[PDB]
Design a protein around this ligand. Structure first.
Ligand SMILES: Cc1cc2nc3c(=O)[nH]c(=O)nc-3n(C[C@H](O)[C@H](O)[C@H](O)COP(=O)(O)OP(=O)(O)OC[C@H]3O[C@@H](n4cnc5c(N)ncnc54)[C@H](O)[C@@H]3O)c2cc1C
Ligand SMILES: Cc1cc2nc3c(=O)[nH]c(=O)nc-3n(C[C@H](O)[C@H](O)[C@H](O)COP(=O)(O)OP(=O)(O)OC[C@H]3O[C@@H](n4cnc5c(N)ncnc54)[C@H](O)[C@@H]3O)c2cc1C
Lengths: 519, 519
């Protein structure tokens, strides 16, 4: 079966074996079974560390053989001929099983050992195929590294009926637990990536190892970033964790009121915040969400933050800077025209609409103030109120109705934002009583339905007002000793970047003062 | 006396006269008196608008003559010959008196009419002098423009004894009200500049004409500047007044904690604040100090700001952003080493002293917190307390005494800051009990004696805490409706640029909300 060349190479690699290896065949009386038998004999005679056994009573394919260690049933199975262009695959299988290490990275190898699921792989190959080896070898290696991962490599030239019954149209053809998995060349990395779902757990295990922090800042927007800088500058152990470094500003373009910078941009500004943070000793943790706070049982103890990923961080002081989310209209066109006429901020975008018509969505204090605000700058304001009447303070309603370039539409529910492919040109809405549809021509839509502070994760831990805002005092202190908050998520009455950053700096100074008095 | 040339030029200029002119001579029997008499006759005959009179009983020099209008005694007097190189001066005097306008700017001419003091000028000249004319002509013109300003031009070749008695050493020699005033060539501008003290009054009269403001911001540091930007962006009538645009930051160099800007400088930052402000419709008033606030008698009325210069501005809302001043050691060396080792801010300069020895001056909460702060960053901290014991909270004192790289000196009064010509190398101090002088080697001196808010001008108008800080709520509201405050001058618990700017932005949003609800 093997020629002189093949024996020579094989004997060369068998000499790299440390551990003994068993080849357990299950055969019938076919010529192909005889060939396999002859084959395993030739390999065995090339090494005192390779033993050939039969066990023809096993419920596996005939012929096939298992590549395993003494006293084990773990390892790759080859059904049919393992020669032709699978010869290298066979050789590698003997090697790995007998102790010889893979060339793959250790990140990859550990990942494979830690795969947390039960998988039975079957690879259909043929002896002339050039894409098959890499696939077969990848799966083979996994069977060696992880006993929950099983692999049988099948020669389609021996099991033609399986090829036909299973409607395999090309090789290599992979199935996992009976389901089609892949076709064509896949890398070990790719295969591992298809089935591994342990990334979240690994990240969480990294985090669990972190030492306690002097200050742990939750939320990495402008407020959290500012706090981190003020904290780290004092040389204390500072952690900064957040879902997305940069916060709300990543979703805007032009910013013209970040004091002393006449014009910057949301993405650019977040990049600058990151550079400023990285000048100091800040442990920045990204793509993580605090899911619970557990206050120290007594003052001076450690506060604990749990993450959605399952980790627990601990710290002598906490700064909550999780900001907020504006409520959307949830209509077609809305997302598409964000920064192109749809805006959530009159303080920010008001001056860009001189001589233009705009709408304000929402009739509470925010919307109605926004309307009055814009009315003094723009040519015309239409306010849309969903309900039969506005909720805003009466003095605001009176003021707005006194304005000459304003109309108010009650019972009005936006249905669509209309643009010209580039910017907003109008608004479609429904009158909720009659059901009639109406269109308004305008250049801007200020959505002012309400703000949603990112604080429900804190329910029962720290006190919030009736709007979800974390109640703070002048020192950014919550009702929990050692726990502070800064920026949009708090009761700070205005939501702006320069405001958030000032608060993050106050909160950080307060947290430091707290550490001095309790440590 | 006059030749054909001189008569020709003179007659040419007399033809520019609108008003009639009198030449009133007071003479004796000297040859020089005769010449003057002959001279005035020749001028008079060249114009029906020029009349020559005598009145030899007047208590003036003999000879001399006055250049005036009919029914007036106002104008320049020439004593002795007005010829030679004074001929042009004489001609100009006749011109101005008879209606012909000066070539000088109107800013200058009005300034001269508005000079508010009683001055009698005497100019000693000679007929061959080339610097005399400009001086004589300047003073002559002033006598024509302002009846409180009198001028007698004196020919030293006729009044040699006055030249000797008065010890005049060169011409032109000017005296005002009997006192030496000038020597050598002076311009009209220069002369006017020596005696005019009406600039302050004029600036105040400019200000008195200003229309009422929607918002008037007092103090043009980072907080006032931020507020101005947030205000003007809403299109309201915004005034920004301050003693010195830029505030405290003008007195520092490197700034490393203005969030998102890893490093800037005090002067540069103030320049950037100014550019940002000027992008909007802001009426910036500089070099003025609010000296009193007079609250609107009722809510909705106009608030009034008085200035030290005597003006009154008025506005629908006020934002007080007058900041603060750190108390100094008041010792030699202190001013010289500012930004070179003398600092007033641990939050700012702490990180620059790794591996160095520093001192903290002051044993209240600020100083002792600063010491504890620095102790975690620097190699060694010495705190100097003036009194027999520290005033800081006991928990802070206990914490500081627990530190291993710290010593505390009580009864200690700094006497000198010592440097090497460039930076601080040490501190000299007195033990107040024994009187002994001591030296400490160090690289930094953090002065933390206390902060002085710029708020005494507000005594009785708005409520302050026991530290002079303007009491505010979360919305930057004072106890007076329509009056807000932001930044260092308030009860905000930390004094930083990013903090001041955030507050100025909050105060501005609050003031706007107030205008919406009351206008
Ligand atoms: C489109 C748009 C444009 C704007 N333009 C301007 C402008 O031109 N000028 C201006 O002054 N303001 C502007 N704003 C306002 C603004 O950006 C906010 O005021 C500011 O970002 C608030 O900072 P923050 O750190 O307090 O909150 P955020 O910016 O919201 O940052 C909070 C971060 O923490 C994260 N987080 C939330 N929950 C958790 C959790 N459980 N665990 C960990 N992290 C969490 C958030 O996802 C977020 O990334 C704009 C807002 C929007 C939406
Ligand atoms: C040397 C030094 C270095 C510093 N470095 C830093 C730093 O690196 N980082 C940092 O965050 N902070 C720093 N600070 C702190 C800091 O600059 C202040 O926090 C900040 O400037 C406060 O801004 P403000 O507008 O509230 O007050 P101010 O900056 O004090 O501005 C107030 C202005 O109003 C004026 N004014 C006062 N009275 C009147 C009146 N009656 N009428 C009209 N105007 C008046 C003041 O003279 C002043 O010009 C430093 C301070 C000093 C002294």
């Amino acid at each position: 079966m093997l020629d002189t060349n093949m024996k020579t190479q094989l004997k060369a690699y068998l000499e790299k074996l440390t551990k003994p290896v068993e080849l357990i065949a299950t055969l019938d009386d076919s010529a192909k079974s005889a060939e396999i038998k002859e084959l395993l004999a030739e390999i065995a005679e090339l090494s005192d560390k390779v033993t050939f056994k039969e066990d023809n009573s096993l419920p596996v394919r005939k012929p096939s053989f298992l590549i395993t260690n003494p006293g084990s049933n773990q390892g790759p199975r080859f059904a049919g001929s393992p020669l032709g262009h699978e010869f290298t695959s066979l050789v590698l299988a003997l090697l790995w099983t007998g102790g010889h290490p893979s060339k793959e990275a250790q990140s990859l190898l550990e990942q494979i050992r830690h795969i947390d699921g039960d998988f039975e792989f079957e690879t259909y190959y043929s002896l002339s195929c050039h894409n098959c080896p890499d696939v077969v070898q990848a799966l083979n290696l996994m069977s060696v590294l992880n006993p929950r991962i099983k692999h049988t490599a099948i020669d389609g030239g021996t099991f033609q009926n399986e090829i036909t019954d299973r409607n395999v149209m090309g090789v290599p053809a992979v199935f996992v637990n009976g389901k089609e998995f892949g076709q064509g060349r896949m890398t070990l990395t790719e295969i591992v990536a298809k089935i591994d779902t342990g990334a979240e757990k690994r990240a969480a295990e990294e985090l669990n190892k972190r030492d306690a922090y002097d200050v742990l800042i939750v939320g990495s927007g402008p407020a959290g970033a500012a706090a981190a800088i003020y904290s780290a500058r004092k040389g204390i152990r500072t952690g900064l964790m957040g879902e997305r470094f940069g916060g709300q500003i990543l979703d805007t373009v032009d910013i013209e009121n970040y004091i002393s910078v006449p014009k910057t941009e949301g993405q650019k500004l977040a990049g600058a915040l990151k550079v400023h943070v990285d000048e100091y000793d800040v442990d920045v943790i990204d793509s993580q969400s605090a899911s619970k706070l557990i206050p120290a049982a007594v003052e001076g103890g450690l506060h604990q933050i749990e993450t959605a990923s399952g980790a627990v961080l601990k710290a002598r002081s906490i700064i909550v800077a999780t900001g907020a989310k504006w409520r959307n209209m949830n209509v077609p066109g809305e997302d598409q025209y964000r920064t192109k006429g749809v805006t959530y901020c009159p303080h920010c975008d008001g001056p860009l609409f001189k001589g233009k018509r705009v709408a304000v969505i929402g009739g509470g204090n925010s919307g109605v103030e926004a309307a009055i605000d814009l009315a003094g700058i723009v040519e015309h304001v239409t306010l849309l109120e969903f309900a039969p009447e506005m909720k805003a303070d009466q003095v605001l309603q009176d003021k707005l109705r006194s304005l000459k370039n304003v109309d108010i539409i009650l019972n009005a529910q936006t249905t669509e934002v209309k643009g010209d492919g580039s910017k907003v040109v109008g608004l479609e809405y429904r009158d909720r009583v009659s059901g009639d549809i109406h269109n308004i021509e305008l250049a801007g839509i200020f959505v002012q339905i309400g703000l949603l502070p990112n604080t429900n994760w804190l329910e029962g831990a720290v006190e919030r007002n009736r709007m979800g805002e974390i109640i703070i005092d002048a020192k950014c202190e919550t009702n929990v000793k050692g726990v502070f908050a800064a920026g949009d998520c708090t009761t700070v009455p205005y939501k702006q970047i320069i405001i958030a950053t000032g608060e993050g700096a106050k909160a950080s100074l307060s947290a430091f003062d707290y550490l001095i008095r309790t440590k």
